[PDB]
Design a binder for this molecule. Structure first.
Ligand SMILES: [Zn+2]
Lengths: 312, 173, 1024, 285, 173
C-alpha cells in the first residue's frame, strides 16, 4: 500500500530544462526540486514494470496500464511526516501538527496573519534541518590538453539529506508489493540511486473539507486558465501557480507537455474541486483521469492524513 | 460591555427560536447586508446533537460547526446548559468578514456536558433540502432579521449562500 | 466637471512662509498693499485666485499631521507659540536640523524677479491647455526655486520637520479627495504592484537582456500611470514622487516638443531638468530615452471619484472602473510595443536578424498577446461619511488616510500569498503535445528545446552550434543568404535557443529607442515613433559581464596606448573609433576616445581561446596584468521601507522589534515608547516643546485620562493671552484632542501616516536615487535598475567595497564631496542652499555576488534574491542598544564567492543615527577592510594574514577584556606583516559581535573579525 | 530489475588524494576536498566515474566500445549507460595513536565514526537483495558495531586507552570480545562517537599552505600563497558499482574490473596526488 | 472502555501528578521506544490557567494544549472539574503515530469552567526552560515509564523532545 523511496545519496530533480553545454562562452547551471513531481515517481515504477508489448507512442496510456493509482508524495524522516507548504515563492517542509490552524490563520487580521505565516516558513519550517543544497560543480576535460574544455563547467545544486529521509507515496494496487520491493532504482536525476520499500498503511481515500493541501501539482486544463486566473483568490488560499512541463518520456526521448499547475504545498479551497469538474470536458477528462492515476491531482486534508483526489 | 450568544444552524428541531432576546440596542455580529452572510463564526472541535439540541465538546479538530452570532441572552428556561465566556473577537475564528469588532465581548455557547452515555461518532451533514432552507429563515433569521421577507431582498442569493457556506458535524444518535 | 482646483492648493502657501510668517523682511508684504496669505494671493496672478473655502482649509488639515501635533487652532494661528528662528528639522530624525536664516525674495524688487521666470515658462502653453500649465509648473515649481538660490524652509516654524515644498505637494495630492467628496463623494487609494520583478529580471543570457527586461518593468508601469498623468494631472501619484522623476521630466519635454513650443523655452526648461532632475548628464538627449530604468515597482495613487468620457469629469460609474482600467491600460502597452516592434522590424526587413524577428513576430502572434510581467492592482475607497460631519471635517478624521492606506497595504500582502508566474497565463498544451510549435532554426531531436534565457518556455529560434554557422544558417530558414549571418550572430549566439518573450527582449535590446512607445504614451502615433528611429542611426552598445571584468585592463592599456599600440596595429585594440556610438554606461561614454575601441568583445581577445596566450604575451611585455574573469553583482535594498510607510518603528529598531511585533505592540511597550516619546519632543522645537513635554509626561503608566489639562491648561491658557484673537478656543478640548492624538500614537506604537509623511519619504527616495546613480558611475559600474530604495548594478571586484562604503553613507545623507549638483550634509542632501531630508535611520542591506563572467545570469540574479531576501532575514548580530547589547537583524552587506559567505554589519548601533555624531561610524567596518586590503597589496602585510587568524581567533573570541584583545590583534597583525612600520588599528568597538544564523544552509563565522577575513578572501578570490 | 549485480569496492589512497570542489566550504582552505551532507570527505560519483573512465580508455584502448556501453559513450551518441557509481563514502581515515603500553604497540590506527558506518550499512543493505553473492560476512560486522553505538570501540585490538592525533584521549571497549577485522592490514580499527570522531578525523585531514616563488628573487609573489586540503595516504573510501543486465557488463565486470588495481582520481597529479587502489569487496571477504 | 487520563505538561507548579492512580492495567498509548515519546495528543481550542492548573476551554482553534494518554483513573478525587469523553481512535488527533488504538476508549482531561468573569487573553509560551526541563525528566513520564530511566533507552532522548514537542498556549491570568 505505502511505498518508501530511500535515497542512498544526494539526488537532483531539476526543472527549467536545458542543462547541457550549448553556448560557447557561458557555463551551465541547474537547481533541484525539493519534492519530485509525480511524473518522476510514476516513471520510476513504470521503468521497473516495463513490457515492450504495450504503448507505441503514449507514455501515459502506456504508463497507466502498469500502475493502478499513486497518491501524492511527502517526507518521512523517523516516522514523522513532513508536508510541502508553499507561499509566494517560499517553500517549507512543515510537520502535520501545524496545518490544522491554517484556514483560521489565513483569515486573521492583517498584522496577526503576517506574524503567524512568517513563523511557519522561518521558525516552524523544518526543511533546512533535513535537506541541504549540495552545490556540486562538474567539468568536462579534453584529453588533448588534459585541462578543462572551453567553459564546459556546470553547477548542479543536488539535494543533500542531513538525516534519513524517505519519499512517501501510496498505491491502490497490492499485487504490486512483491514486485517493487527491495529494488534498487535509478530515481530520476543525474544517474542517482534510491531504494524502494513497501509496507501496508491504512489511510482514507475520499473526504470533504473546505481547505485542502496540494500534495502534488494540480493540473489546470489550459482551457479554464482564463476563467481561473482572473479570479485566483476564489480557488487558492496560498501557494504558487506556474507553468510546468510534465517531464521527459524515455520510450520516445521527447519532453512531455507543458501546462499550468498549482504547485505542491499550496492550499486550495474547496471551490477548486467542483470548478475543475465543471470546466474540464470529456474530450480531456479521459486524459486528465490518467494524469490523476500517475498521481497529479492529489489533495490532503489539513485535519489528518486523508488523501482525496479531484476527478476521483 | 456587550452581550452576544451563539446558535448553531443545523437541519433539525428545537432550534426554531431560543434567544428570547433580540437586538435591544443596535448591535449584531452576524449580518445580511444584501451581499451575503458576513462574520460567520465556526467552532473547531465541537459536535451538535439533535437530541437535546446543543453542542458537545468532542476532541476532533475535524468536527467544525458553523452558526451565527447576534446580540441576545439565553432563554433562561435553562440558564445553565449554555457555556458563557469572554473571548476577544480577534480570538474568534470567523468567516468572510465585513469589519472588526469591539475586541472585548461576552459570548454564550449552547452546550452539553460531554454525554458519556455513548461513544461519539460525528458525521458531516448537508443542508440542501430547500424546504428546510425555508423554515430556518423564518424560525431563526426572522426573530433577528424580520426585514428579509419584506420590502426588498435578493432572496435567490442570500438564502443561496446559506446552502454554500454553512455546514457542520452532527452526531447522528 | 472642471475641478482643476489643485493649483490653488499648490500655491496656497508660498515658499516664503517662515520669513513672511513671524516676519524677517516684513516689507514685501508692505510693498504691495491675515498676513502670509496676502503674499500667497499676490503670487497667484496667472489665473483664478485663492478660494477661502473648501479648497485649502480641509485639505491643508489632512495633508500633514502638523495640525494634530501642534494643535488645530494654534496651527492656523501663527500666534502665541511663536519662535523667531527658522530651523529645518529632518522628518525621520529630529536631533538633526539645518538653519535657514535668510535667502529668499525679500522685496517685490526681488519677489517678481522669479514670477517673471514662472510666467516666461508657462507663457508658451496655450491658455486652453491648462493640463500642461499644471504639469509643467508641477515639476519646475521647486526647480526654478532652487536655481534662484533660495534656502528651503519648513512648512511651520513650530514643527519644522516638513519642507514647505513637500507639504505644498501633499495638500495638492489630498486635494483630489477633498474635491471629489465636496461633490457626490467617492475617493480611492489605488495601488499597483508587479508580481515577480526579480524573476523577470533574472531571465536573460546577457546584460542587455537584464537591462532591457529591467527597463520593461519601468516602461510598462509608466505607460499605465501616464494615463492618470493625462487625466488628473500630476499629484495623483504618491509613489513614486513625480517631482524628481527622470521618467516624468523626459515625458514632460516630449509633450512640449509635441504641439509646438518656443525652441528656447523647451530649452529654457531643459537646463533646469539637466541640472537637477538629472545631474549635468544630457546623455538622455543623445540616447533619446531616459538612460536608467528607475523601477518604482510599487505605485500608489490617490484618485478622486471622478471619471471622464463625458467629455469632462463625472461621477464614477462603479468602483471597479479603476482596476479594470489599469489592467487593460497595462496590456495595451505590451500590444503597442509588439506593434511597434512589428512595424520597425519590417521597416528594416533587410539587414539580417530582423527578417528573423519579422518571421517570429508573425509566427507567434497568439503567444505575444500576453504581457510577460503580470502586474496586480488593488484599491480602497473613502466616503463623505468617514470624513465630514455636515460640510466640515469630523473629529478623528485625521486618521482616515492612515487607516485607508493600512487596508491597502494589507490587501497587497494578503494577495502576495499566491504567486502566479506570468508563464502560467500562456496556452502551451497542444503546442507541445503535438508538434505545432513554430521552431525557426534547428528541429528539436527531443521535443521542443526550452529557452536558454527563461528555461520555462519552449524555444522558437533554435541556433546551431559552432560546427559551422554559414552552411547551417543559410540552408535552414534562418538565414536568407550569407551577408545576414554576421548580423544575426551579432545579436544571437550560436547554440542559443530563444522563446518568443526572450526574443522580444533581444529585439528591444538591439534597439532600445523603441521603448519610447511606452515612455511617452498616447502622445505620438506608433508609426511616428518608429519613423524617428529609422530616421537616425543611434547605436547604443550595452556592456556585458566580460566588459565589466575588463575595466582595469581597458583602463590600463588606455594609458599605455602608444606602447601597446604598434605591436597590434590590426587587432581592433588600436582601431580608431569609426562612429559616434554611445551608451548609458557612464564609463564607456567617459573614455571611448583614447584610440582604444572599447567596443571589442573581450571573448575574441584576452578572454578567448584561440587568442588567450597571444594577449597574455602582449600584456606580458607591457607590464599589463592579465584580467580576472570575475565581476561583482551588487544589489542594494533598503530595510523595512514599505514597513516604514506604515509609520511603524521597525526601521528604527531593526531586530529589537520586528514586523511581527506589531501584532501586539504592548510586548515591546517599553522601547516603542522610549523612541516615540523621543521623536515627538525633539520634533516641534520652540516654546511649544515644553507644552508637549508635559503632555507625554501625563501618560506613561495609564495616567490621568484627560485629567492632565491641569498640567497643560496652564501651559496653553497662560499662552493664549499673548494675542487677543482667540475666537472660540475651548482649551479644555484643545488639550484633550492633543492628548487624544499622542494617545493613539503611543497606543498604536507607530507614527500616524499622512500624505506629507509619504510625499516627503517618496521625494527623498527619488533624490537618494540621484546620488546613488553618480556613485555607481563614479565606481565604473553599470546600473541595471535603481528605482528608489532598490538597486542592481555590476561593479568590478575592485571598486565594490568602497562603493558599499560610500553608498551606505550617502543613503544616510552623510557623505564627502558632491556627486552631481547636490552635496551630502549629515543627513541632509543640499542642492544649491536648498536643504532636503534624507533617510538616515533606514537600514540598507547589500548583497555582493562575485561571479565569473561566464556564470549563467539566471542563477546569479536568483542567488542575489535568495542569498539576501531569505538570508538577510535570518542574520542576527550583537548591536549596542541604549547601553545594553541586543540582537539586531538588518543592514548586513552580505558577500558571496561560490560557497564562501561573509556578513559585515553596517550599523552596530540600533537606532542607526540619533545624533549628528552617529554618521562617521556608519559602515565603519568597511574601511577597516578597505584599509586592511590597502596595506596588503602594498606588501606592507602578507596575505598570510588571512590564513593565520584561525589560531588567534579562539583567544580573541574567549577574551572579554578589551585591553587584552587590542594586543592580540596587534600581535596577529605584526606577526605576518612584511615590514616593521605598519601600525594598523581596529576600531576596538568591533571586539565581540557574534553574528548568528538560524538553521540555514549558510555558514557564517560567529564573530566579526573572522567575517572581515572572509570578506577579504572573497574580494581576493575574485581577482585571480 | 535492470540492476542485475552490484560490485562494492574499497578506494585505498596510495598517495594523498585531492578531489577538488572549487571553494565550497569555509574553514580556511582555498581548494578544499569534496565534502558530503555532514562534512566528511567524499568522492562524487561524477569524479569517480570520469576518472575511472578517463583511465581505462588509455589502458584498454581496444575495448573502448565495451567501456562506452557501460560508462557512458561521451561522444554525441546518447544511448543510456549500463553502469553507475555511488558516491565514495569515507570509511576509515588513518590516525596517529599513542597507547599507554596497552597492547602490542602501534603508531597509527584506522578511525571511523558511527555516522560514517551507517552510510556504509545503508549501501550494504541496499544491494543485498540483488547480490546473490551475499556479502553478509561483511554486512553483519557493521551491524554488530552499530549495535554497540554510543561509545568508543576497538574491533580486534585490546587497548582500552589511547591518544589519537596527539590531542584526544579516548578509552576503548572491545566489540564484545573479538571479531575479524575488515581491512586485512594488521592495523586496529576504532569507531568513535560522532562528536569525538569528527575532531579526530578533521585532524588527520592534511591542510597545507602552498607558495608560488618569484624565480628571480626567490621570494614569494604577492598573493602567491593559497591553501589546499588532502586526504592522507592509507585512507579508505567505500563505493559500489551498480550494473544493469547486459552482455557488455558481463565482459566489463569480468575482463575489465579484474585488472583494475590502481587508478588515478582527483587532481594535482603533478604533485602525485591521485594514485589510489581499488580492492573489490568480493575477494577480501 | 479504559480509564485513560490525559495530563498536561505546562509551566505550572501543581503539575506534579494530581492523580494518585497509575497504570492500573498494563496498557498505554504514549511510548518512549528508542525514538522518543510516541502518540502525543494535541488539545486545540483549549488554554491553561496558571493558578488552578487545568485545561481552560476556548473556541479559538489556534489555542492548543499537548499532553500524553495514560490509563490511570482521574485521581478518584474530583469527579467534577474533569471532562470525560467516550471517544474512538480516529477522533484522537495524535502526533508520532506508531500503533493504532482499540478505537473505543474513555478519556478524562483536566477541565475548568469557562470562568466568564474577565476577558480572555491567551499567550504563547515555550517549556524549554533548561532549569525546569530536568524536573520533567522525573516529574511526569518516569513515574509512568520508570522502565526507560533505569536500564533502557536514555532519558536524554526524552529531553530534546519536550523542548521540541510540547509547547502550549497559556493564560497569564
Ligand atoms: Zn525565454
Amino acid at each position: 500500500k505505502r511505498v518508501l523511496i530511500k535515497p542512498l545519496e544526494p539526488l537532483m530533480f531539476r526543472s527549467q530544462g536545458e542543462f547541457e553545454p550549448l553556448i560557447t562562452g557561458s557555463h551551465t547551471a541547474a537547481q533541484s526540486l525539493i519534492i519530485p513531481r509525480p511524473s518522476t515517481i510514476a516513471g520510476m515504477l513504470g521503468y521497473i514494470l516495463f513490457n515492450k508489448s504495450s504503448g507505441t507512442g503514449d507514455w501515459l496510456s502506456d504508463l497507466t496500464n502498469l500502475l493502478a493509482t499513486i497518491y501524492g508524495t511527502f517526507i518521512e524522516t523517523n516516522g514523522e511526516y513532513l508536508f510541502p507548504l508553499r507561499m509566494g515563492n517560499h517553500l517549507a517542509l512543515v510537520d502535520q501538527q501545524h496545518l490544522i490552524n491554517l484556514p483560521t490563520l489565513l483569515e486573521k487580521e492583517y498584522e496577526r496573519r503576517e506574524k503567524g505565516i512568517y513563523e511557519l516558513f522561518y521558525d516552524k519550517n523544518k526543511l533546512f534541518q533535513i535537506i541541504n543544497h549540495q552545490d556540486r560543480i562538474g567539468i568536462s576535460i579534453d584529453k588533448s590538453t588534459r585541462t578543462v574544455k572551453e567553459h564546459y563547467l556546470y553547477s548542479a545544486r543536488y539535494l543533500a539529506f542531513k538525516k534519513e529521509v524517505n519519499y512517501v507515496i501510496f498505491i491502490d494496487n497490492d499485487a504490486i508489493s512483491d514486485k517493487i520491493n527491495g529494488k534498487i532504482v535509478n530515481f530520476g536525476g543525474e544517474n542517482r540511486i534510491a531504494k524502494l520499500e513497501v509496507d501496508d498503511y491504512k489511510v482514507d481515500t475520499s473526504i470533504e473539507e473546505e481547505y485542502y493541501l496540494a500534495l502534488s501539482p494540480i493540473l489546470i486544463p489550459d482551457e479554464a486558465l482564463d476563467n481561473f486566473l482572473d479570479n485566483i483568490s476564489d480557488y487558492v488560499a496560498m501557494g504558487k501557480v506556474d507553468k510546468i512541463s510534465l517531464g521527459f518520456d524515455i520510450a520516445n526521448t521527447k519532453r512531455k507537455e507543458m501546462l499550468t499547475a498549482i504547485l505542491e504545498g499550496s492550499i486550495v479551497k474547496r471551490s477548486i474541486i467542483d470548478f475543475i469538474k465543471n470546466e474540464i470536458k470529456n474530450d480531456l477528462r479521459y486524459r486528465f483521469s490518467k494524469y490523476e492515476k500517475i498521481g497529479y491531482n492529489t489533495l490532503m486534508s489539513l485535519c489528518k492524513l486523508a488523501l482525496r483526489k479531484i476527478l476521483s | 460591555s456587550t452581550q452576544r450568544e451563539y446558535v448553531f444552524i443545523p437541519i433539525t428541531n428545537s432550534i426554531t427560536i431560543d434567544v428570547k432576546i433580540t437586538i435591544g440596542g443596535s448591535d449584531h455580529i452576524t449580518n445580511i447586508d444584501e451581499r451575503g452572510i458576513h462574520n460567520v463564526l465556526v467552532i473547531t472541535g465541537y459536535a451538535v446533537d439533535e437530541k437535546n439540541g446543543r453542542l458537545v465538546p468532542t476532541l476532533d479538530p475535524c468536527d467544525y460547526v458553523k452558526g451565527i452570532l447576534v446580540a441576545g441572552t439565553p432563554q433562561q428556561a435553562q440558564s445553565n446548559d449554555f457555556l458563557t465566556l469572554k473571548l476577544p473577537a480577534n480570538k474568534l475564528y470567523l468567516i468572510r468578514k465585513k469589519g472588526n469588532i469591539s475586541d472585548d465581548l461576552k459570548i454564550y455557547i449552547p452546550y452539553s456536558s460531554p454525554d458519556a452515555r455513548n461513544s461519539m461518532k460525528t458525521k458531516p451533514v448537508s443542508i440542501s433540502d430547500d424546504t428546510i432552507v425555508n423554515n430556518i429563515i423564518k424560525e431563526v433569521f426572522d426573530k433577528i432579521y424580520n426585514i428579509t421577507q419584506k420590502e426588498k431582498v435578493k432572496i435567490e442569493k442570500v438564502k443561496e449562500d446559506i446552502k454554500e457556506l454553512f455546514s457542520y458535524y452532527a452526531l447522528e444518535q | 466637471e472642471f475641478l482643476d482646483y489643485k493649483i490653488i492648493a499648490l500655491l496656497h502657501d508660498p515658499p516664503n512662509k517662515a520669513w513672511v510668517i513671524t516676519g524677517r523682511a516684513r516689507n514685501l508684504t508692505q510693498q504691495l498693499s491675515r498676513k502670509h496669505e496676502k503674499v500667497a494671493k499676490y503670487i497667484i496672478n496667472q489665473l483664478f485666485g485663492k478660494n477661502y473655502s473648501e479648497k485649502v482649509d480641509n485639505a491643508d488639515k489632512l495633508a500633514s499631521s502638523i495640525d494634530r501635533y501642534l494643535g488645530s487652532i494654534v496651527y492656523k494661528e501663527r500666534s502665541l507659540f511663536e519662535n523667531r528662528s527658522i530651523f529645518l528639522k529632518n522628518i525621520l530624525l529630529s536631533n538633526i536640523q539645518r538653519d535657514i536664516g535668510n535667502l529668499f525674495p525679500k522685496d517685490k524688487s526681488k519677489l517678481d524677479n522669479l514670477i517673471l521666470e514662472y510666467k516666461k515658462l508657462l507663457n508658451v502653453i496655450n491658455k486652453t491647455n491648462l493640463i500642461l500649465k499644471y504639469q509643467l509648473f508641477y515639476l519646475i515649481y521647486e526647480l526654478v526655486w532652487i536655481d534662484s538660490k533660495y534656502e528651503n524652509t519648513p512648512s511651520d516654524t513650530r514643527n519644522p520637520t516638513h519642507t514647505i515644498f513637500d507639504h505644498l505637494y501633499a495638500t495638492a495630492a489630498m486635494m483630489n479627495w477633498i474635491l471629489s467628496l465636496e461633490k457626490e463623494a467617492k475617493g480611492y487609494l489605488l495601488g499597483i504592484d508587479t508580481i515577480g520583478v526579480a524573476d523577470f529580471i533574472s531571465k536573460g543570457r546577457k546584460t542587455r537582456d537584464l537591462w532591457i527586461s529591467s527597463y520593461l518593468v519601468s516602461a510598462l508601469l509608466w505607460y499605465v500611470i501616464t494615463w492618470f498623468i493625462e487625466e488628473y494631472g500630476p499629484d495623483v501619484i504618491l509613489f513614486p514622487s513625480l517631482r524628481f522623476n527622470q521618467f516624468y521630466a523626459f515625458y514632460l519635454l516630449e509633450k512640449l516638443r509635441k504641439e509646438g513650443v518656443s525652441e528656447d523655452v523647451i530649452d529654457e526648461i531643459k537646463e533646469l531638468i539637466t541640472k537637477y532632475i538629472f545631474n549635468g548628464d544630457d546623455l538622455f538627449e543623445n540616447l533619446k530615452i531616459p538612460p536608467y530604468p528607475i523601477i518604482p515597482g510599487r505605485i500608489t495613487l490617490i484618485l478622486p471619484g471622478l471619471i471622464r468620457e463625458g467629455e469632462e469629469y463625472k461621477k464614477v460609474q462603479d468602483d471597479n472602473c479603476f482596476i479594470s482600467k489599469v489592467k487593460e491600460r497595462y496590456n495595451e502597452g505590451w500590444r503597442k510595443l509588439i506593434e511597434g516592434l512589428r512595424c520597425y522590424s519590417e521597416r528594416k526587413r533587410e539587414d539580417g536578424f530582423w527578417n528573423l524577428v519579422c518571421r517570429v513576430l508573425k509566427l507567434t502572434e497568439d503567444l505575444l498577446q500576453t504581457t510577460p510581467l503580470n502586474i496586480r492592482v488593488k484599491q480602497v475607497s473613502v466616503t463623505e461619511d468617514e470624513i465630514f460631519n455636515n460640510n466640515k471635517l469630523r473629529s478623528d478624521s485625521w486618521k482616515i488616510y492612515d487607516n485607508k492606506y493600512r487596508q491597502l497595504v494589507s490587501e497587497f500582502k494578503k494577495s502576495k500569498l499566491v504567486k502566479v508566474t506570468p508563464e502560467s497565463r500562456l496556452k502551451l498544451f497542444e503546442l507541445t503535445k503535438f508538434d505545432k510549435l513554430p521552431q525557426i532554426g534547428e528541429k528539436s531531436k527531443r521535443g521542443y528545446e526550452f529557452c536558454t534565457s527563461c528555461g520555462v518556455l519552449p524555444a522558437v529560434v533554435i541556433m546551431p552550434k559552432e560546427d559551422e554557422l554559414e552552411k547551417k544558417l543559410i540552408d535552414l530558414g534562418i538565414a536568407r543568404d550569407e551577408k545576414d549571418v554576421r548580423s544575426i550572430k551579432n545579436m544571437i549566439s550560436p547554440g542559443e535557443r530563444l522563446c518568443p518573450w526572450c526574443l522580444v527582449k533581444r529585439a528591444l535590446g538591439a534597439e532600445p529607442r523603441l521603448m519610447r512607445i511606452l515612455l511617452l504614451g498616447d502622445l505620438y502615433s506608433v508609426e511616428k515613433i518608429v519613423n524617428e528611429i529609422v530616421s537616425r542611426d543611434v547605436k547604443i552598445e550595452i556592456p556585458s559581464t566580460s566588459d565589466i571584468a575588463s575595466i582595469k585592463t581597458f583602463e590600463e592599456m588606455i594609458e599605455k596606448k602608444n606602447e601597446i599600440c604598434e605591436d597590434l596595429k590590426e587587432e581592433e585594440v588600436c582601431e580608431k573609433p569609426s562612429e559616434s556610438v554611445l551608451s548609458m554606461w557612464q564609463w564607456f561614454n567617459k573614455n571611448y576616445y583614447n584610440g582604444i575601441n572599447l567596443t571589442i568583445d573581450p571573448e575574441e581577445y584576452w578572454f578567448s581561446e584561440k587568442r588567450r596566450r597571444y594577449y597574455f604575451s602582449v600584456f606580458r611585455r607591457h607590464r599589463i596584468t592579465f584580467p580576472s574573469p570575475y565581476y561583482a553583482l551588487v544589489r542594494a535594498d533598503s530595510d523595512y521601507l514599505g514597513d516604514l510607510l506604515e509609520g511603524k518603528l521597525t526601521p528604527y529598531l531593526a531586530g529589537i522589534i520586528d514586523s511581527g511585533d506589531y501584532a501586539n505592540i504592548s510586548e515591546k511597550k517599553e522601547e516603542v515608547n522610549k523612541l516615540l516619546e523621543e521623536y515627538l519632543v525633539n520634533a516641534g522645537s520652540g516654546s511649544i516643546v515644553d507644552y508637549v513635554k508635559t503632555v507625554l509626561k501625563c501618560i506613561r503608566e495609564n495616567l490621568n485620562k484627560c485629567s492632565c489639562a491641569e498640567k497643560i491648561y496652564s501651559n496653553e491658557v497662560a499662552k493664549v493671552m499673548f494675542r487677543v484673537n482667540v475666537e472660540k478656543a475651548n482649551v479644555e478640548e484643545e488639550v484633550k484632542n492633543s492628548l487624544e492624538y499622542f494617545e493613539t500614537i503611543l497606543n498604536e506604537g507607530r507614527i500616524i501616516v499622512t500624505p506629507a509623511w509619504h510625499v516627503s519619504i517618496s521625494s527623498a527616495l527619488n533624490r537618494g536615487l540621484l546620488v546613488e546613480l553618480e556613485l555607481v558611475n563614479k565606481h565604473k559600474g553599470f546600473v541595471i535598475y535603481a528605482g528608489g530604495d532598490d538597486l542592481l548594478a555590476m561593479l568590478p571586484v575592485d571598486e565594490v567595497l568602497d562603493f558599499i562604503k560610500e553608498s551606505r553613507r550617502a543613503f544616510a545623507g552623510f557623505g564627502t564631496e558632491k556627486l552631481g549638483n547636490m552635496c551630502l550634509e549629515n543627513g541632509f542632501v543640499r542642492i544649491n542652499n536648498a536643504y532636503y531630508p534624507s533617510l538616515p535611520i533606514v537600514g540598507r542591506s547589500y548583497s555582493v555576488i562575485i561571479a565569473h563572467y561566464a556564470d549563467p545570469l539566471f542563477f546569479v540574479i536568483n542567488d542575489s534574491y535568495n542569498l539576501l531576501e531569505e538570508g538577510k532575514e535570518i542574520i542576527r548580530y550583537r548591536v549596542m542598544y541604549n547601553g545594553e547589547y541586543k540582537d539586531a537583524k538588518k543592514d548586513v552587506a552580505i558577500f558571496r564567492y561560490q560557497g564562501l559567505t561573509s556578513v559585515i554589519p553596517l550599523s552596530l548601533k540600533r537606532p542607526i543615527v540619533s545624533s549628528v555624531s552617529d554618521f562617521n561610524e556608519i559602515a565603519s567596518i568597511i574601511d577597516v577592510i578597505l584599509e586592511l586590503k590597502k596595506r596588503i597589496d602594498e606588501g606592507r602585510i602578507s596575505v598570510s594574514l588571512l590564513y593565520d587568524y584561525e589560531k588567534y581567533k579562539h583567544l580573541i573570541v574567549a577574551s572579554d577584556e578589551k585591553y587584552l584583545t587590542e594586543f592580540l590583534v596587534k600581535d596577529w597583525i605584526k606577526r605576518n606583516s612584511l615590514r616593521k612600520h605598519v601600525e594598523f588599528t581596529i576600531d576596538e568597538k568591533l571586539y565581540g559581535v557574534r553574528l548568528t544564523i538560524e538553521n540555514y544552509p549558510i555558514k557564517i563565522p560567529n564573530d566579526l573579525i573572522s567575517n572581515i577575513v572572509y570578506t577579504l578572501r572573497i574580494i581576493y578570490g575574485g581577482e585571480k | 530489475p535492470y540492476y542485475a549485480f552490484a560490485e562494492p569496492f574499497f578506494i585505498h589512497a596510495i598517495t594523498h588524494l585531492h578531489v577538488g570542489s572549487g571553494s565550497s566550504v569555509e574553514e580556511e582552505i582555498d581548494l578544499p576536498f569534496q565534502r558530503d551532507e555532514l562534512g566528511y570527505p567524499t568522492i562524487y560519483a561524477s569524479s569517480l566515474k570520469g576518472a575511472i573512465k578517463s583511465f581505462l580508455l588509455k589502458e584498454f584502448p581496444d575495448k573502448r566500445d565495451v567501456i562506452y556501453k557501460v560508462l557512458g559513450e561521451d561522444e554525441n551518441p546518447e544511448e543510456a549507460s549500463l553502469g553507475t557509481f555511488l558516491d565514495a563514502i569515507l570509511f576509515a581515515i588513518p590516525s596517529r595513536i599513542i597507547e599507554i603500553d596497552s597492547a602490542k604497540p602501534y603508531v597509527w590506527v584506522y578511525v571511523t565514526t558511527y555516522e560514517l558506518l551507517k552510510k556504509v550499512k545503508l549501501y550494504l543493505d541496499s544491494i543485498s537483495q540483488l547480490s546473490n553473492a551475499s556479502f553478509s560476512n561483511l554486512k553483519n560486522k557493521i551491524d554488530t558495531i552499530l549495535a554497540k553505538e554510543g561509545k568508543n570501540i576497538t574491533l580486534d585490538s585490546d587497548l582500552k586507552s589511547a591518544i589519537l592525533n596527539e590531542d584526544f584521549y579516548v578509552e576503548l571497549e572491545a566489540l564484545n570480545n573479538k571479531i575479524p577485522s575488515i581491512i586485512n592490514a594488521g592495523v586496529p580499527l576504532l569507531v568513535l562517537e560522532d562528536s569525538i570522531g569528527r575532531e579526530v578525523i578533521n585532524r588527520s585531514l592534511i591542510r597545507v599552505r602552498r607558495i608560488r616563488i618569484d624565480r628571480d628573487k626567490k621570494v614569494v609573489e604577492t598573493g602567491g600563497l593559497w591553501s589546499e586540503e588532502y586526504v592522507p595516504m592509507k585512507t579508505i573510501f567505500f563505493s559500489v558499482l551498480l550494473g544493469k543486465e547486459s552482455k557488455e557488463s558481463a565482459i566489463f565486470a569480468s575482463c575489465i574490473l579484474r585488472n583494475l588495481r590502481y587508478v588515478i582520481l582527483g587532481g594535482k597529479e603533478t604533485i602525485g596526488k591521485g594514485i589510489v587502489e581499488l580492492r573489490w569487496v568480493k575477494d577480501v571477504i
